[PDB]
Design a protein around this ligand. Structure first.
Ligand SMILES: O=c1[nH]c(=O)n([C@H]2C[C@H]3O[C@](c4ccccc4)(P(=O)(O)O)OC[C@H]3O2)cc1/C=C/P(=O)(O)O
Ligand SMILES: O=c1[nH]c(=O)n([C@H]2C[C@H]3O[C@](c4ccccc4)(P(=O)(O)O)OC[C@H]3O2)cc1/C=C/P(=O)(O)O
Ligand SMILES: [Mg+2]
Ligand SMILES: [Mg+2]
Lengths: 193, 193
């Protein structure tokens, strides 16, 4: 079977929108970064440049209970992955990194998957801080540079569009999946025998 | 670097001893299976044959809060893995499967690793129900038959001795690690260039 790894935050689950909503609600008198203006992968670094002490306040949002659990799915994500997993000769794993503060995040990621994909889909979860040691044909992930212990990962990394990466020019033959409305089936079919 | 995957339950953490202690304390008037007499990988199947309704009582032990967190390390396990991870050209990942009931288990496994190996070791955790999709040179695991989506895993599976597998004759050239007092370094060195 063709094997596809799908990232969670910024691909399945709307980490950026969730973060902004909760930040504004908790820190209504602080300045914030509109999603369109997000630059750089690390939210807290951008916030830290905007005002002193804002990096720590940003961090307190994703460390809070229910932050991960209450993320909304990105449009099309649940439908696409469900269809993808039902395709013949196609094994789909949700491959995601928990944050360092582990009190809520791993638990809530399991709970989120159960909620949107159902109990049977829990067998498809891989939690890891290193994706290069997970072998597959494809990795769909919004992070531009994915590295770790394995210098030559078996997967092709398809960059999932996010505001933070939308301007990035990629080194051919690297490619993008622009959203779940985009033609993911053609990408998968291009890797099949 | 040589890459080694190490299982948690029955290899690092004493799932069998922990289970028995808690079962006896919770169900003092039920019969139990002494560790020496454990047969078959699945604890609940053996308990279920011993008396009707015992399978469900067994399951309630590992579903309970603090079951995973309070497991004792197997003798030598923490020392060995710490030394192993400090070796040159050697990357060690703790590769473990959470149980289906996810309320406590993933969280407590992270907490256990932090407790025995320290915060920095949390980056080395891989949670998965499928180990065949994790690529490495070696997998040290007490489970005799490890299968999943990848029909030809890259690792050599070294069987870690447990009471449930201690009589098993293995198909050459399959081999065992008899305990952490056993010569794990020689096993690793045998895979190096
Ligand atoms: O896209 C993101 N942007 C972002 O700013 N963060 C935040 C949350 C927290 O995540 C981490 C993080 C680093 C690597 C992998 C997951 C999370 P940490 O666990 O180190 O605190 O990095 C610093 C912080 O940055 C996470 C993510 C999620 C990364 P992925 O989608 O899990 O790869
Ligand atoms: O060795 C074991 N023996 C055992 O009886 N169990 C119990 C706990 C529960 O674990 C499971 C289980 C199945 C596969 C992988 C982990 C756990 P489930 O999550 O399906 O309930 O299997 C049924 C039950 O069997 C777990 C383990 C731990 C298996 P690993 O060390 O995680 O591979
Ligand atoms: Mg992401
Ligand atoms: Mg085990």
């Amino acid at each position: 079977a063709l094997r596809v790894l799908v990232d969670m935050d910024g691909v399945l689950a709307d980490f950026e929108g969730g973060f902004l909503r909760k930040f504004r609600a908790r820190f209504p008198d602080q300045p914030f970064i509109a999603l369109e203006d997000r630059r750089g992968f690390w939210v807290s670094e951008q916030y830290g440049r905007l005002r002193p002490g804002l990096s720590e306040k940003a961090i307190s949002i994703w460390e809070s209970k229910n932050f991960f659990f209450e993320l909304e799915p990105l449009p099309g994500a649940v439908e696409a992955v469900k269809e993808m997993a039902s395709l013949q000769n196609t094994d789909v794993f949700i491959c995601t990194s928990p944050i360092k503060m582990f009190k809520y995040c791993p638990y809530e990621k399991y709970a989120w998957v159960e909620k949107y994909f159902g109990p049977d889909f829990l067998e498809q979860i891989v939690l890891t801080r290193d994706k290069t040691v997970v072998s597959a044909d494809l990795l769909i992930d919004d992070r531009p540079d994915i590295t770790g212990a394995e210098p030559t990962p078996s997967w092709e990394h398809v960059l999932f569009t996010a505001c933070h990466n939308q301007h990035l020019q990629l080194q051919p033959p690297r490619r993008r999946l622009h959203s779940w409305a985009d033609d993911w089936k053609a990408i998968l079919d291009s890797k099949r025998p």
